[PDB]
Amino acid sequence: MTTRDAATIKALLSHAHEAQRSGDVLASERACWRVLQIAPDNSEALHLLGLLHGECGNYGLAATLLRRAVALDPGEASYHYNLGNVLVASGQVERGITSLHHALELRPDYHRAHSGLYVALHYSALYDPRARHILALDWARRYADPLTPVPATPVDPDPHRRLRIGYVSGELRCHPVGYFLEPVIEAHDRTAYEVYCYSNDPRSDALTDRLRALSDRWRDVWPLTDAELCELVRRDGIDILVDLSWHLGMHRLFAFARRPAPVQVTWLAAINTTGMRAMDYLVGDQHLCPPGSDELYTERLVRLSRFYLPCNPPPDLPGWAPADGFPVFGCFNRLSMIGPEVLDLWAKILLALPRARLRLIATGLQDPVTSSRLMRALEGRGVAGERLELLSPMPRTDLLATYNDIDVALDTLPYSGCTTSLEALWMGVPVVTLEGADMAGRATSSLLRWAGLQELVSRTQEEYIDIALGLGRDLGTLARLREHLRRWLRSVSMSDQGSFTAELEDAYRRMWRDACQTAA
Ligand SMILES: O=c1ccn([C@@H]2O[C@H](COP(=O)(O)OP(=O)(O)O)[C@@H](O)[C@H]2O)c(=O)[nH]1
């Protein structure tokens, strides 16, 4: 006789895939375990448990589930793809890049692995701006530019009429994207603009409920094809469509590829070009996007004369403590951003201030394997591993509150942080950064320059060290900077929401004028 197993597995395996596509993680996981109880060499279920734990941040389990899936079926490109992403996210950038290469070698038309690879390069100093640029263009040429028509003249090209703005993202939720979009959506001038949001992910938390309520129109987009989304955007009559996700998120750039709107913009998540002809504008700022940078972008750079994001803090802000070995340095950035280049500098700072402690908080630090590897990485640079204190990730306000126990924040290179740096300043903690010759290494350099704190902005790695040393020694400059931030916080709490979105609206208007104008 034979067994009904194969049928039971298949029903569990499709149920598991539905559960994960709809957002129900705990249900997809338990179904994957049920498959492995019956058939523990099932590489499809190993793989899916791999993804889910990778999304949850358990990179230790994730990686070994995905490596076992690779061993059982090494020809399957998607198993290599997802292993590469886990490895990059865990801090092992070069090992992940290799895995991403394998996925492309096995399936040369893998558009998600090609993006992932493009993204991954920004976490490594080994790939210059020319290499990243080329790979992006290569992607666009393959998957985007074939779909793109020539720019048509806008419908009802009235330079002064009320404009419809469409925000397209798959991280409209408790997430940097959602955090910076909320103020913009609330403060948009309804006399001159109308706000459509296109949510490209099913996860709907308290912030999505707020974004939905603040939007004029909503639209849940994840179940639609790119062609279906295009005919939806066209029917809504969107004048300016905005890519909030970029290559880093659950984007919808093949819908953008077709030019459903006459003005198409990438903003907020972008750290480099999309590579696409179909993207007209990228919205940055004057410090963020350096003078000779434009040749690196298919989009036209829009250098706003303020910081490229709204800096007003949330209402539920923990509020500052009276302060409290000194000094405690801090870096609450993703592990992908903490590689060999940064660790070399952080070690040199810790040798020169032999009592100072470094405090990292990120996803993956719950696993002993990844915290051990980080401790050992520092000991190899002559720094005792006990001086390094690693913490598992926390809720937003709980994390904000732990800045009270930090004297100075350190920013990553070559991929500069952004929202962690802003969060630090909100809690009266100064941030030391390197200004890279590169948009991806300038999110903090810009922020700091626009907030008056140019003295915390190094142009060289040895200057980075010196600034961090200077702050660890002098209590006075710390108390000066803590007050500068107290005044800045209040100023930004009051004006910055409306001040920013007016400057952005000014940019949207000039994009629109120019679209109508050149039809004459
Ligand atoms: O343990 C953590 C770490 C981060 N975050 C939040 O998620 C964001 C992720 O920032 P990231 O680590 O990607 O660095 P960034 O790119 O903002 O510099 C932060 O701003 C925090 O608000 C959190 O809730 N818990």
Numbering used by the authors: 1 to 324, 329 to 524
Article sentences:
TtOGT was co-crystallized with the product of O-GlcNAc transfer, UDP. The structure, solved by molecular replacement and refined against synchrotron diffraction data of 2.8 Å, revealed an ordered N-terminal TPR domain and a bilobal catalytic domain at the C terminus. The TtOGT TPR domain itself displays good structural similarity with that of hOGT (r.m.s.d. = 1.3 Å for 106 Cα atoms). However, a deletion at the region previously designated as the tetratricopeptide-like region (TLR) results in a major change in the orientation of the TPR domain relative to the GT41 catalytic domain compared with hOGT. This more direct/rigid fusion of the TtOGT TPRs to the GT41 domain compared with that of hOGT creates a relatively narrow groove for the protein substrates to bind near the active site. However, the GT41 domain of TtOGT is similar to that of hOGT (r.m.s.d. = 1.5 Å for 303 Cα atoms) despite the absence of the intervening domain of unknown function that is positioned between the two lobes of this domain in hOGT. Catalysis of O-GlcNAc transfer is facilitated by the pro-RP oxygen of the α-phosphate acting as the catalytic base. It is proposed that the presence of an oxyanion hole formed by backbone amides of His920, Thr921, and Thr922 (equivalent to Cys422, Thr423, and Thr424 in TtOGT; maximum atomic shift of 1.7 Å), an α-helical electrostatic dipole, and the evolutionarily conserved Lys842 (Lys341in TtOGT) function together to ensure the correct positioning of the donor substrate and to stabilize the negative charge developing on the leaving group. Strikingly, the hydrophobic pocket formed by Met501, Leu502, and Cys917 at the hOGT active site, which fits the N-acetyl moiety of UDP-GlcNAc in the hOGT active site, is not apparent in the TtOGT·UDP complex. It is possible that a conformational change is required to form this hydrophobic pocket and perhaps to reorient the TPRs to create an active site groove that is more permissive for docking of a protein substrate.
In contrast, modification of cytoplasmic proteins with a single O-linked N-acetylglucosamine (O-GlcNAc)4 is a regulatory post-translational modification that is dependent on a single O-GlcNAc-transferase (OGT), which transfers the O-GlcNAc moiety onto target proteins, and O-GlcNAcase (OGA), which can reverse this process. In this report, we describe the identification of the first complete putative bacterial protein O-GlcNAcylation system, found in the soil thermophile Thermobaculum terrenum. We identified the products of genes Tter_2822 (hereafter Ttogt) and Tter_0116 (hereafter Ttoga) as putative OGT and OGA orthologues, respectively. To investigate the catalytic machinery and conservation of substrate/product binding modes, we determined the crystal structures of TtOGT and TtOGA.
